[PDB]
Amino acid sequence: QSKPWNRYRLPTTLLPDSYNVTLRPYLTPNADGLYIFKGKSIVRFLCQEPTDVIIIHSKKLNYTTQGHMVVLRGVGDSQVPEIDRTELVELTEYLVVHLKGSLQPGHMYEMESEFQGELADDLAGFYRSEYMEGNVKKVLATTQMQSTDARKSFPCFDEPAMKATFNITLIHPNNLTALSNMPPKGSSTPLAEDPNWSVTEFETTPVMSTYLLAYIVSEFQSVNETAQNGVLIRIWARPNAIAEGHGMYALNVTGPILNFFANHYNTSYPLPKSDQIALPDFNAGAMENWGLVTYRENALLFDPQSSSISNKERVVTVIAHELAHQWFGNLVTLAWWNDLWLNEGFASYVEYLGADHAEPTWNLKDLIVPGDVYRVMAVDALASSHPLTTPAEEVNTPAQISEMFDSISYSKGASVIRMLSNFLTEDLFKEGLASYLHAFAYQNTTYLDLWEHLQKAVDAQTSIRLPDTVRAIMDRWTLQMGFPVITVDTKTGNISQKHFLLDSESNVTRSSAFDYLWIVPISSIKNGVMQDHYWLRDVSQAQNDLFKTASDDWVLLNVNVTGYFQVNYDEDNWRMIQHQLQTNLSVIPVINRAQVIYDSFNLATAHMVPVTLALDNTLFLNGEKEYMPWQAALSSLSYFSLMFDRSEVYGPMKKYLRKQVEPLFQHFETLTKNWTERPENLMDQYSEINAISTACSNGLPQCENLAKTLFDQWMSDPENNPIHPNLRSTIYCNAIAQGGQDQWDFAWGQLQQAQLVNEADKLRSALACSNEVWLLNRYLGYTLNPDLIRKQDATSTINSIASNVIGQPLAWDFVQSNWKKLFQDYGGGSFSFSNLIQGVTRRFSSEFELQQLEQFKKNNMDVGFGSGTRALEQALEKTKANIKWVKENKEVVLNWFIEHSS
Ligand SMILES: *[C@@H]1O[C@H](CO)[C@@H](O[C@@H]2O[C@H](CO)[C@@H](O[C@@H]3O[C@H](CO)[C@@H](O)[C@H](O)[C@H]3NC(C)=O)[C@H](O)[C@H]2NC(C)=O)[C@H](O)[C@H]1NC(C)=O
Ligand SMILES: *[C@@H]1O[C@H](CO)[C@@H](O[C@@H]2O[C@H](CO)[C@@H](O[C@@H]3O[C@H](CO)[C@@H](O)[C@H](O)[C@H]3NC(C)=O)[C@H](O)[C@H]2NC(C)=O)[C@H](O)[C@H]1NC(C)=O
Ligand SMILES: *[C@@H]1O[C@H](CO)[C@@H](O[C@@H]2O[C@H](CO)[C@@H](O[C@@H]3O[C@H](CO)[C@@H](O)[C@H](O)[C@H]3NC(C)=O)[C@H](O)[C@H]2NC(C)=O)[C@H](O)[C@H]1NC(C)=O
Ligand SMILES: *[C@@H]1O[C@H](CO)[C@@H](O[C@@H]2O[C@H](CO)[C@@H](O)[C@H](O)[C@H]2NC(C)=O)[C@H](O)[C@H]1NC(C)=O
Ligand SMILES: *[C@@H]1O[C@H](CO)[C@@H](O[C@@H]2O[C@H](CO)[C@@H](O)[C@H](O)[C@H]2NC(C)=O)[C@H](O)[C@H]1NC(C)=O
Ligand SMILES: *[C@@H]1O[C@H](CO)[C@@H](O[C@@H]2O[C@H](CO)[C@@H](O)[C@H](O)[C@H]2NC(C)=O)[C@H](O)[C@H]1NC(C)=O
Ligand SMILES: *[C@@H]1O[C@H](CO)[C@@H](O[C@@H]2O[C@H](CO)[C@@H](O)[C@H](O)[C@H]2NC(C)=O)[C@H](O)[C@H]1NC(C)=O
Ligand SMILES: *[C@@H]1O[C@H](CO)[C@@H](O[C@@H]2O[C@H](CO)[C@@H](O)[C@H](O)[C@H]2NC(C)=O)[C@H](O)[C@H]1NC(C)=O
Ligand SMILES: *[C@@H]1O[C@H](CO)[C@@H](O[C@@H]2O[C@H](CO)[C@@H](O)[C@H](O)[C@H]2NC(C)=O)[C@H](O)[C@H]1NC(C)=O
Ligand SMILES: *[C@@H]1O[C@H](CO)[C@@H](O)[C@H](O)[C@H]1NC(C)=O
Ligand SMILES: *[C@@H]1O[C@H](CO)[C@@H](O)[C@H](O)[C@H]1NC(C)=O
Ligand SMILES: [Zn+2]
Q1: Which one of 27, 75, 205, 459 is most buried, by most CB atoms within 10 A?
Q2: Residues with C-beta less than 6 Å from any ligand 11 atom
Q3: CATH of domain 221-482
Q4: 322 catalytic residue (yes or no)
Q5: Residue 472 is assigned to a ligand binding site
Q6: What Pfam families does the annotation carry?
Q7: Distance CA 890, CA 640 (A)
Q8: Quick one: which atom of ligand 8 is closest to the CA of 494?
Q9: In the chain, which segments carry CATH 2.60.40.1730?
Q10: Phi and psi for 580 in degrees, rounded to 5?
Q11: Nearest CA, atom 16, ligand 5
Q12: Do residues 865 and 872 lie in contact, with contact meaning Cβ atoms separated by under 8 Å?
């Protein structure tokens, strides 16, 4: 029998009740440059089953407790066994307290410890973050427990189902502010031992999970709002960011978002206050700590002066996402990490609903389709994918837990939940959701608990009828990987399903309990009119007159792509859809106008339609004004550009795109009143951004003229940038492309003095658009200079240069020649060789380039590839696939573009 301290899952013999935790970060290093924090904790737990051992999590903590590593006491008049010994078991991250007798069921005990750890700059547990304010380097203390790092800050039963209340105290410099999940109990008091420090106590948390705890010590300031219900809302950030008003947009949307969710969930916001904090360089992006949500600065802050509309969209959606968790995930918590997909998938869906409430004119809900659905379908259409569900017994180690946080969990999770809400109807979904939250508040669940409550809602009504139980249907979408392609023969109305793979040659080896058959909800529109809903059952082939058409009619499936599948038709129906889009596109919902493009290109890749059919689906775009269908084409054609932009195909391709985008460019020229006023709503602003990008990058003279005019105007008056933030990336790039060292040196100067990261990012990227070899080479020479290009921006900059058709060989030579820099950037800065390799070899599509890459690999004699080890193998296999693709498609594609480029 294995010893319990050698198992990754905690015993169930002891359950926590409540903790007292006091933490004291030392923001001044110890002269050796080591930063530490000290702590003291008492955990009160109940004995469920007799046991003579206490096993609790502890990671990277040294104990200074008097005696053994802990002191153990009985609660009330309970007696306690004597401690035999305490030991740390590093592998399973445990503190183990061996007793001389057994704890008794029903009795409560209190275990006290004193400890200290490194306050490392490692974004894990209680950690430090360094940043600059003027000439002064600032250091703050903050937390990231997410998943399994609470145990890195204090000893605890660190599993999400083992909830408890927490009493947090922070001891900190008296001129800094201390924040935690809950409000402070009152004013801070001087630390008696040293009044230079103060003590801030926080109100008891509700019953909650360790991974959601947070505490922060900083010089940050806030903007505030009190909601009508008395809930205090604050946005926290660097004093200078606050002064500049960069926290205002976040403050603006937070109240409405919280209001939306309280109603959506039929459950009051469960906390007295809401803090959200913008942290510089928070690489985790954002973390839903209950009552104290952390964000990277560029995700929470917004500068109206320099930020584009896409920045606003990022802010409102990221906030909606994290605030969604304040109920779903935090109030009701999934019992184990194998069900992470339900938590993150749910939030990834409802972020659009919450954001839509804050910005109801933006049509934000549409963005899940390009943003999550088609994004995740790219990886879920591979033999190497995996089901949403994972058996709980297979997820044990911190590494295995971390593997749960991927594209499948977030984006496919969002897609299937959205599909579920749609086929149940939102009203029914919300009823089951409310029932679920009410039943399990302050407790833990599995995904089966949600299905059960949704089923209760279904069973309580008569309108919505399903072909099977909620669980049976959802099992098809969660227990097996991938998704079907739905193929329709409109001559007969025959309809079929099969597991969709982008590679028609790939072998699926992962077995499915369902033989890769799904139960599929299928909406349809015929001649622009909605039809009755249909369910495809667990059969490969079926027939229905809903999908049978006349010679002059057309049918289109999966309205607004609510269903997690792609659709193919017979060529006659395709041609009819094309005809409709050519004559009156308004008859087909905008999302489905995009779908036709997204799906057909994927179908071409899989050899289910000819590549010419996919290209034919872009023909209507000359009359398309809306964002998504254009985006679908640009996303689908980026690979074509990547493969052909150095070949004879490129001329006709650009000419075709110029032809398609010119009418849209002209449209916005008038609408925007000579480019003086942006379109009103988000989607139209996005359409303008893409139109200008497409026009300029494909050499439309009218766009080139606009870019030159604006950049010249800016150069004549640097302090007054005349270029609207929305268009900066294109205008900067195209103008630098047209100009020489005058434009380049001007932009370089602007970059070196840039205050905001987003503006700096745009400048770095645009500088790579120069068509002068000597400028691109001189630029490459700067990428490895920390004084000129930040280390964290180095590979990004090289990749931008590589993206330039002229910069391609320059960057590839630069990477090869300077590869002897791995022993300089791996132990002192990750650098990420994987991203560099992928970006520079992205274009490779010939046997000659394959030989060059194989020749580059021949430096195998030590030096390795570091974190990019075997990422080179991905480039080798990708090149082989590109070679095969170009050979198969070159002639057909060239002729199509010539044929349609006028
Ligand atoms: C977890 O932390 C809690 C907050 O500190 C502890 O509860 C507090 O205990 C204090 C004493 O340990 C009480 O303060 C005063 O202590 C003096 C001792 O000399 C007593 O005479 C006073 O009666 C007492 N003050 C009052 C007003 O009664 C705090 O009152 C008390 N705070 C509370 C109950 O909110 C917990 O004891 C601690 N848990 C464990 C297990 O140690
Ligand atoms: C938790 O306890 C650990 C073990 O006691 C500490 O790690 C050790 O720190 C020691 C002191 O910094 C290192 O020993 C040597 O100390 C002298 C004088 O300080 C230095 O000149 C030496 O450079 C140093 N040795 C080395 C190899 O650098 C130990 O090496 C080191 N042990 C390790 C890393 O296993 C932790 O510091 C302590 N942590 C906290 C937060 O208290
Ligand atoms: C957070 O919410 C605030 C309240 O809704 C917004 O405040 C609005 O800012 C707008 C832009 O600054 C103002 O619109 C116009 O601004 C121009 C230029 O300053 C003025 O000439 C106009 O008079 C003014 N009004 C118009 C066009 O009707 C709004 O006046 C102002 N609204 C209110 C109620 O104060 C913030 O913009 C918003 N913050 C962010 C970052 O979105
Ligand atoms: C954290 O603080 C809370 C609030 O003071 C403590 O809750 C009290 O616990 C004691 C003993 O268990 C009870 O007699 C009181 O009724 C509780 N008060 C409330 C408001 O619930 C809690 O015990 C503290 N946690 C720890 C570990 O001491
Ligand atoms: C809080 O107090 C500390 C300590 O006095 C301040 O830190 C100093 O800041 C000045 C800048 O004015 C630096 O020159 C010193 O090097 C800092 N000293 C140390 C020991 O770090 C800090 O500025 C104060 N912060 C606030 C917000 O009042
Ligand atoms: C949760 O939803 C319930 C049911 O919709 C709400 O209770 C209803 O409130 C309306 C508003 O006037 C009344 O007309 C109904 O009679 C109520 N129904 C029932 C069954 O009580 C409730 O207000 C919501 N609660 C929260 C916290 O959002
Ligand atoms: C995990 O969640 C379950 C509920 O899904 C908790 O079990 C419930 O506990 C409450 C409070 O004691 C009881 O009222 C219910 O009867 C229990 N429901 C069951 C067993 O289905 C369970 O306590 C939670 N686990 C932990 C460690 O707290
Ligand atoms: C549509 O499906 C039907 C049946 O579901 C197919 O018709 C059958 O074709 C087979 C061919 O071997 C015959 O043995 C059966 O007698 C036919 N059944 C009938 C007429 O009821 C038909 O081929 C399918 N059409 C397609 C795929 O276009
Ligand atoms: C498909 O999506 C479109 C939006 O892209 C839906 O149209 C919206 O419908 C709601 C509710 O009727 C209106 O409040 C909006 O004004 C509509 N927006 C636009 C831009 O038209 C449409 O309802 C969806 N179709 C189906 C069948 O669900
Ligand atoms: C898949 O299996 C086939 C035989 O069915 C084989 O020819 C082929 O090499 C395998 N792998 C791929 C990637 O096609
Ligand atoms: C095009 O279709 C739309 C959507 O039904 C309709 O409102 C409009 O009248 C049609 N326009 C023309 C010119 O046929
Ligand atoms: Zn999330």
Answers
A1: 205
A2: 584, 586-587
A3: 1.10.390.10
A4: yes
A5: no
A6: ERAP1_C, Peptidase_M1, Peptidase_M1_N
A7: 10
A8: 1
A9: 1-220
A10: -60, -45
A11: 136
A12: yes
